[PDB]
Amino acid sequence: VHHDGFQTVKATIDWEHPMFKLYEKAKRNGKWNPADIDFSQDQKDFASLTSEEKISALPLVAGFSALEEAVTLDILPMAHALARQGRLEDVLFLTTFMHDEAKHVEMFSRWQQAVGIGQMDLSVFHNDHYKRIFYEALPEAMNRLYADDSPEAVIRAATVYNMIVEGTLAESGYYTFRQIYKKAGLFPGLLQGIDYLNMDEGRHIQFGIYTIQRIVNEDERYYELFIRYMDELWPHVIGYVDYLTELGKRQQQLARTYALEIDYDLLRHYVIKQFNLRKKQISRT
Amino acid sequence: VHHDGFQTVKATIDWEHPMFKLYEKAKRNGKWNPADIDFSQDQKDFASLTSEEKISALPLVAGFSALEEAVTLDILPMAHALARQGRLEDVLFLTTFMHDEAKHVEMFSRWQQAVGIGQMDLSVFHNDHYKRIFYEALPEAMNRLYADDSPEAVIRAATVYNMIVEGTLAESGYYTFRQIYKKAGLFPGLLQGIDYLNMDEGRHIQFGIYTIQRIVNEDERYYELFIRYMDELWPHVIGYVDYLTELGKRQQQLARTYALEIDYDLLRHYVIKQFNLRKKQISRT
Numbered sequence A, B: 001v002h003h004d005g006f007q008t009v010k011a012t013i014d015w016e017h018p019m020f021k022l023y024e025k026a027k028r029n030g031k032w033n034p035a036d037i038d039f040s041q042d043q044k045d046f047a048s049l050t051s052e053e054k055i056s057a058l059p060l061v062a063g064f065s066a067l068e069e070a071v072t073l074d075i076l077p078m079a080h081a082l083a084r085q086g087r088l089e090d091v092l093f094l095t096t097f098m099h100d101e102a103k104h105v106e107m108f109s110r111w112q113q114a115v116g117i118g119q120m121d122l123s124v125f126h127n128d129h130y131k132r133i134f135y136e137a138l139p140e141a142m143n144r145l146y147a148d149d150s151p152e153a154v155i156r157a158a159t160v161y162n163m164i165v166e167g168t169l170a171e172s173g174y175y176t177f178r179q180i181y182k183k184a185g186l187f188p189g190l191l192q193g194i195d196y197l198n199m200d201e202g203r204h205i206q207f208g209i210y211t212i213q214r215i216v217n218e219d220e221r222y223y224e225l226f227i228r229y230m231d232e233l234w235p236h237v238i239g240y241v242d243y244l245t246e247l248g249k250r251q252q253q254l255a256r257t258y259a260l261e262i263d264y265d266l267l268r269h270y271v272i273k274q275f276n277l278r279k280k281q282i283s284r285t
């Protein structure tokens, strides 16, 4: 379908648009390159583990590698729908979003390669709840935007992607990585990568908050849709958390070897806390 | 539609894929930020011009600002179609492509703002041939990919976008900018921007060559489709070139003021040369 005009021919960028400002920050804070991370110490750490200590870390890496890959692919329909509404500054920012996610995919794949599990298929650690969110509901809600860009549809896409997948699960995964392996002194390259990912994620979540809030602001009834879509996904959120928890409670040789009181009750409550504070960043009014 | 698996969970990135290597180079060579360009000298240059010297430079800026904006929006369907075919490394690279184009839009808009023409609507310098390529045929060929990702459709999208819009028109515009204003000592910020754009453009054109060649390689008959779609667009290419040429031949006060023998016959032959060497970068075999 045709371009009727061009904003930067008729006028300029809206330099005060929040998403143009977030775009600017993304360029400033987005220079990191996963190709510069030194994973040589991670290779040695991983090889030094027992086979039982080795399994301990694979579930979380499985959940993240697919997370990053899903969101790299699944942001495209959001950029399309906003482009078609003429929201140029949103699109500018989203180019940084998509590129961040490509780096995230790259970072986890480089780690798997470097530690020697690239040839191992980690799909086994995706249980039914994980598959529901990442194999199904995330691509459903995003691909919807190709044919339905109603406020309802846009809110639901930003809820699943930015508020749940990123704002709840990814954020809790970053915390979990630090609580466990940063305590242990293991896997320094991977944790440098996690620190960069977590910084990028702040912008991703702010795009979701801005997107959701700008639609709530038009019609306070969309607040309820937001809460509702958060609650609809919680069962799968926690059911993946319990599944990982059981996996860790059954494989505790890395816990004992490195003197890590892995506090699953505290990881669980951090997930709960993430979920509820994402709610509280959307004002009904 | 659902993800069946994830390549970086089952395996890794194909680290030897040409588009993964181009992605890597894009990160290394893609750090420039239009927000760092100093346009203060451009503001003074532009204000020092006569009204007749002022008009001289606006057509080319009009053609480019819409070019960058069109290609920022219109690359999205290519990333989608390749994502859906599972071509992960292509997608990784294309995130750098889309972000480059956002910076290109940004660069021209910052110049217009800084020199004081942001509020002026430059659409008047888009004649009928330009509108056919950029308002119509480019978005048609790209949006097609949402519903038809046949080799025919992919070849035609890369021909219009990478080989014509970028590989022929943009490349000739860069040359034209240097031949004219770099000679004059005018507009140093803008020309720094053009140098960065031209570097980015090399990767864009190589994605198009790779994309077109990998389909030609399957079936040598697609070579003819390539040539044919190049020839179909040439009339509008040159008809925009003639239109700009007449505009410059009629407004030659900037030419005289800065002692610039503007050689339109040489700009024309450079456009012709670009068009033909893009053909010669696709091997029929």
Ligand SMILES: CCCCCCCC(=O)O
Pocket (backbone or CB within 6 Å): A060, A063, A064, A067, A169, A170, A172, A173, A176, A241, A244, A245, A264, A267, A268, A271
């Ligand atoms: C203790 C397990 C809870 C952490 C959530 C991990 C989310 C993810 O890995 O994508």
Ligand SMILES: CCCCCCCC(=O)O
Pocket (backbone or CB within 6 Å): B060, B063, B064, B067, B169, B170, B172, B173, B176, B241, B244, B245, B264, B267, B268, B271
């Ligand atoms: C002498 C005019 C020929 C240069 C082609 C300019 C292409 C563009 O401005 O997008």
Ligand SMILES: [Fe+3]
Pocket (backbone or CB within 6 Å): A068, A071, A100, A101, A104, A197
């Ligand atoms: Fe990510």
Ligand SMILES: [Fe+3]
Pocket (backbone or CB within 6 Å): A071, A101, A166, A200, A201, A204
């Ligand atoms: Fe993210």
Ligand SMILES: [Fe+3]
Pocket (backbone or CB within 6 Å): B068, B071, B100, B101, B104, B197
């Ligand atoms: Fe460009």
Ligand SMILES: [Fe+3]
Pocket (backbone or CB within 6 Å): B071, B101, B166, B200, B201, B204
């Ligand atoms: Fe380009």
